[PDB]
Design a protein around this nucleic acid. Structure first.
Lengths: 23, 426, 133, 192, 37, 136
RNA sequence: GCCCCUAAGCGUGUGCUAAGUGGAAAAGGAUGUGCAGUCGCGAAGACAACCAGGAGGUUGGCUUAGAAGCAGCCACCCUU
């Protein structure tokens, strides 16, 4: 689960503005 | 477990033992069990059969009439008064096109729905898992419409297909592993059950175990005698775990009253090995209180069924509980005029209504002789300055009155052996 | 120092009296003789006694009295009673010892104040429901 | 019974709208409307703290003499809006009134005595409409249920109203009902 | 020292505390002592 | 047991949960109430357990009132059957609740124990809930 | 984005952070601090502490193996 959790939580960076593909 | 729609049921049986009266009693017992489980009995019938048919458990013509009557009554549930096989039930269902179960299925369902604690809930769950174990291949729905459920191919060398064991074998393996884990768990909690009463039987004290077929005590006798109110009911198999209290004589020695769950005749041989609580309790009990109903059609049937179960467990566990006194309660109900018939061959038939009642003075006075076997029987003379000569001579259990003297007092009562062995001096 | 209030018309029948007399290194019969000669002679009503055994083994008691709650016990009352507060009437106390009730003892556990009569008028009366009329 | 009006301040809202309302609310003010029989639409910005304080002290029915740029306006609260999640005010309706106006008002009822030692007491609806003058508005009317046998239904037909007060709603709606105390069996049965 | 994410006093005599960062309950009775961890 | 006597449509979409509850934001029947603070899908067994706890706390007095009722048959897919081929059978009776809605109400003399039992019932629910009063 | 890698600020001021939280996360609990209001007391020295205060008929209650302030119980209109 850790892999998916990290992947989808990376979207919370200031550069992604909370939207991240495949997440 | 899964519970579905009820209240539309039919009952099918085969009368191969006993007489017509006994077959009718079995039918009535099944009807009462279904009623308690939450069903409405529509039609229950028995076939005079030497042994159940190996196809439908009833026979071709019987199945025809059952289809007719069930179609006319608009029911969709059939109940067999026995322990049918997957082969039996497959045809018994294909002949009617409605759900089919048996008395053991009914009993497991009611146990599951009445279970109070995780302990018994897991026990009943294991019982039903192990009853449904045979129906992996026997589950035609599981093993039907399955063309290509696996890789039906071979070859020399690379195959890349990894059902290295038959899909049915994998199912058997997985369910066996589940059941093994559950069995390990129910064995493990043996220690938990033990340590719960660990304090008990350490300080040895008389233990009277109240035994009886289902619907006999339902903890009513416990509530009436000890005075502690616990779950008591007129329904069947309501008390799902034991419970002890302090009730005793005027003597300070406690008579721990051990509750027992009901024992229905013709058990499905799945709980008698799982639900060990009551069995261990009766094994360790000092006295037995056998509960009987004085207005039943055949109290002796339940009496001997209980006696047989007790003897089986006794021989299994290498013990011998000599004290076995019966009590024919449920006489205050006045629903049985065979009181003289019972009394002419069965002493100690005190009367208590189904849920309430009194008149247990004679009961207690007759029961005491079998548990009041202490060895104290020591008298002493305490001197003028009693001071601390009150600890275990008066502030103890089985302590009696005595005379008085100027030089302290002549205590003519009984002092317990372990508590006061030599501390007293004549 | 021990004090008692249960039925005092006794001749050493019960542990509170017999062993008490026979213990504590006191005379086996002197205090009992004085007790029976004085209090039983005086109708042997409820007679609380305090033990203050001096070095001479003699502690003279007095004509003690129960509180204003249960003065009838000594006056003309029955030993019966109740245990729950605010219980139904059991008996009455006539206005004959209105001041004598205050002549027995005047103090409390603490050194707070005085007028134990003005305290007991309503302190230990409502405990069981005993009435005073 | 004759209360005294409470002095207060209230400034005319310069700009209106949702953004203005939110900004004023964040600041601490509250937008309200002062209407009246004189047909005088107004948009005032009251102080949330003072408004809450006067409500809690003098209840909902409190004469607020709010200074309208020097001159005073006698205002009577009609209804108020409280956000469900914050319990914070959002607006209220004020009626500009004078001395000598028997305007209808809404009041609550409490109980002084509790109940008998073998029964129970409950509240049906503590909302009664009365006719009281503008300068004298009662509040929190008491109800006598001191040691009263159960089974009775005290409506608004036996409520003692102060001088110069009249009831509006019929004296038939249930305000209180002294019902017998249930047992454990009934308490489990209800809602089962 | 029954440990669990949740604790609370049992008697009026035992008192909560934040010892060494981890929260505990100190009781005159050794049976009621607990820690969060 | 709290089950609807019948339903106009036995299978229905999932109930949209958005915003704050327009109504049921105060104690009407009782005096102290359970004001929820998060979207939740309450069920018959949940409410039954909460009521059991409340009535076990309360012995022979006071009163409790259920505010919400499960009136949405929520269908769970049947046994594995992969996926597809029609909707599942009704298996739950759910009630949607949004923030601010009142679930339970009670009127009890003993205020301390009343609030205690209310807090216990709240803990039994799957969402945060405050205790509110009929008065302001 | 601006300490080094890595270009740009170990920027300026007002506060929080003790957890490296920052630099994953829930139901739950909880004398941390940052900061709003508020309670009867209340700079009378409040409050804590040192403190004289050790069975009032106080061994009653349901009772007598004692109900021995005291296993426990339904009440504390009780004061120079």
């Amino acid at each position: 689960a850790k892999r998916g959790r990290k992947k989808r939580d990376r979207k919370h960076s200031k550069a992604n503005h909370g939207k991240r593909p495949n997440a | 477990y899964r519970q579905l729609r009820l209240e539309r049921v039919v009952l099918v049986g085969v009368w191969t033992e006993g007489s017509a009266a006994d077959a009718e009693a079995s039918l009535a017992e099944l009807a009462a069990l279904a009623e308690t489980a939450g069903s409405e009995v529509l039609e229950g019938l028995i076939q005079r059969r030497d042994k159940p048919d190996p196809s439908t458990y009833i026979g071709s013509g019987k199945a025809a009439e059952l289809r007719e009557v069930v179609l006319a009554t608009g029911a969709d549930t059939v109940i067999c008064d026995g322990e049918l096989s997957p082969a039996q039930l497959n045809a018994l269902e294909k002949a009617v096109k409605v759900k089919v179960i048996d008395r053991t299925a009914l009993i497991l369902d009611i146990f599951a729905q009445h279970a109070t604690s995780r302990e018994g809930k897991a026990q009943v769950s294991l019982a039903q898992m192990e009853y449904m174990l045979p129906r992996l291949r026997g589950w035609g729905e599981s093993m039907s419409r399955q063309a290509g459920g696996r890789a039906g191919g071979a070859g020399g060398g690379v195959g890349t297909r990894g059902p290295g064991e038959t899909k049915i074998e994998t199912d058997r393996r997985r369910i066996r592993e589940r059941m093994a884990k559950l069995r390990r768990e129910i064995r493990d909690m043996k220690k938990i059950r033990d340590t719960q009463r660990g304090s008990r039987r350490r300080s040895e004290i008389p233990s009277v175990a109240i035994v009886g077929y289902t619907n006999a005590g339902k903890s009513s006798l416990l509530n009436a005698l000890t005075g502690a109110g616990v779950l008591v009911e007129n329904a069947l198999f309501a008390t799902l775990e034991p419970t002890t209290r302090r009730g005793e004589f005027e003597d300070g020695r406690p008579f721990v009253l051990t509750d027992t769950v009901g024992f229905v005749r013709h058990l499905p041989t799945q709980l008698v090995e799982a639900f060990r609580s009551t069995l261990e309790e009766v094994v360790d009990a000092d006295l037995l209180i056998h509960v009987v109903d004085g207005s039943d059609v055949n109290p002796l049937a339940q009496i001997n069924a209980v006696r047989t179960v007790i003897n089986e467990v006794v021989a299994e566990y290498d013990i011998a509980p000599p004290p076995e006194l019966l009590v024919v309660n449920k006489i205050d109900a006045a629903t049985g005029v065979g009181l003289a018939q019972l009394r002419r061959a069965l002493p100690d038939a005190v009367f208590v209504s189904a849920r309430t009642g009194d008149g247990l003075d004679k009961l207690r006075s007759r029961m005491g002789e079998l548990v009041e076997s202490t060895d104290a029987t020591v008298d002493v003379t305490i001197p003028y300055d009693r001071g601390d000569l009150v600890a275990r001579v008066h502030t103890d259990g089985h302590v009696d009155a005595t005379e008085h003297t100027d030089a302290g007092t002549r205590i003519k009562a009984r002092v317990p052996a372990p508590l006061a062995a030599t501390l007293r001096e004549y | 120092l021990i004090k008692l209030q249960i039925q005092a018309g006794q001749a050493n029948p019960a542990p509170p009296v017999g062993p008490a007399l026979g213990q504590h290194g006191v005379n086996i019969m002197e205090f009992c003789k004085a007790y029976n000669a004085a209090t039983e002679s005086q109708r042997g009503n409820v007679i609380p006694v305090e033990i203050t055994v001096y070095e001479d083994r003699s502690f003279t008691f007095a004509l003690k009295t129960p509180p204003a709650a249960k003065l009838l016990l000594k006056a003309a009352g029955v030993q019966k009673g109740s245990g729950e507060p605010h219980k139904t009437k059991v008996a009455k106390v006539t206005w004959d010892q209105v001041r004598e009730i205050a002549e027995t003892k005047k103090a409390d556990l603490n050194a707070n104040d005085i007028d134990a009569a003005a305290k007991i008028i309503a302190g230990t009366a409502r405990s069981m429901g005993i009435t005073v009329e | 019974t004759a209360n005294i009006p409470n002095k207060l301040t209230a400034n005319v809202r310069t700009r209106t709208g949702k953004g203005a309302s939110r900004q004023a609310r964040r600041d601490g003010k509250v937008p309200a409307v002062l209407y009246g029989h004189g047909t005088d639409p107004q948009h005032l910005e009251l102080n949330a703290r003072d408004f809450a304080a006067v409500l809690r002290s003098h209840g909902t029915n409190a004469i607020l003499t709010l200074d309208i740029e020097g001159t005073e306006q006698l205002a009577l609260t009609k209804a108020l809006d409280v956000h469900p999640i914050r319990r914070n005010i959002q607006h209220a309706d004020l009626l500009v009134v004078q001395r000598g106006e028997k305007v209808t008002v809404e009041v609550t009822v409490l109980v002084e005595g509790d109940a008998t030692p073998g029964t129970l007491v409950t509240q049906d609806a503590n909302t009664i409409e009365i006719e009281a003058e503008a300068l004298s508005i009662p509040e929190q009317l008491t109800v006598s249920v001191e040691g009263v046998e159960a089974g009775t239904q005290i409506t608004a037909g036996q409520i003692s109203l102060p001088e110069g007060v009249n009831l509006i709603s019929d004296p038939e709606l249930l305000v209180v009902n002294v019902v017998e105390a249930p047992s454990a069996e009934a308490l489990e049965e209800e809602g089962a | 020292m029954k440990v669990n994410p949740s604790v609370k006093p049992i008697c009026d005599k035992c008192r909560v505390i934040r010892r060494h960062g981890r929260v505990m309950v100190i009781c005159s009775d050794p049976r009621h002592k607990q820690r969060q961890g | 047991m709290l089950i609807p006597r019948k339903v106009k449509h036995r299978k229905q979409h999932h109930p949209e949960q958005r915003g704050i509850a327009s109504g049921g934001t105060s104690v009407s029947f009782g005096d102290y109430g359970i004001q929820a603070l998060e979207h939740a899908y309450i069920t018959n067994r949940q409410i039954e357990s909460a009521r059991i706890a409340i009535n076990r706390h309360i012995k022979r007095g006071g009163k409790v009132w259920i505010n919400i009722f499960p009136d949405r048959p929520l269908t769970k897919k049947p046994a594995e059957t992969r996926m597809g081929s029609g909707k599942g059978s009704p298996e739950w009776w759910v009630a949607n609740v949004k923030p601010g809605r009142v679930l339970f109400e009670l009127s009890y003399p003993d205020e301390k124990t009343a609030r205690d039992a209310l807090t216990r019932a709240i803990h039994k629910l799957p969402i945060k809930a405050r205790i509110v009063t009929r008065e302001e």
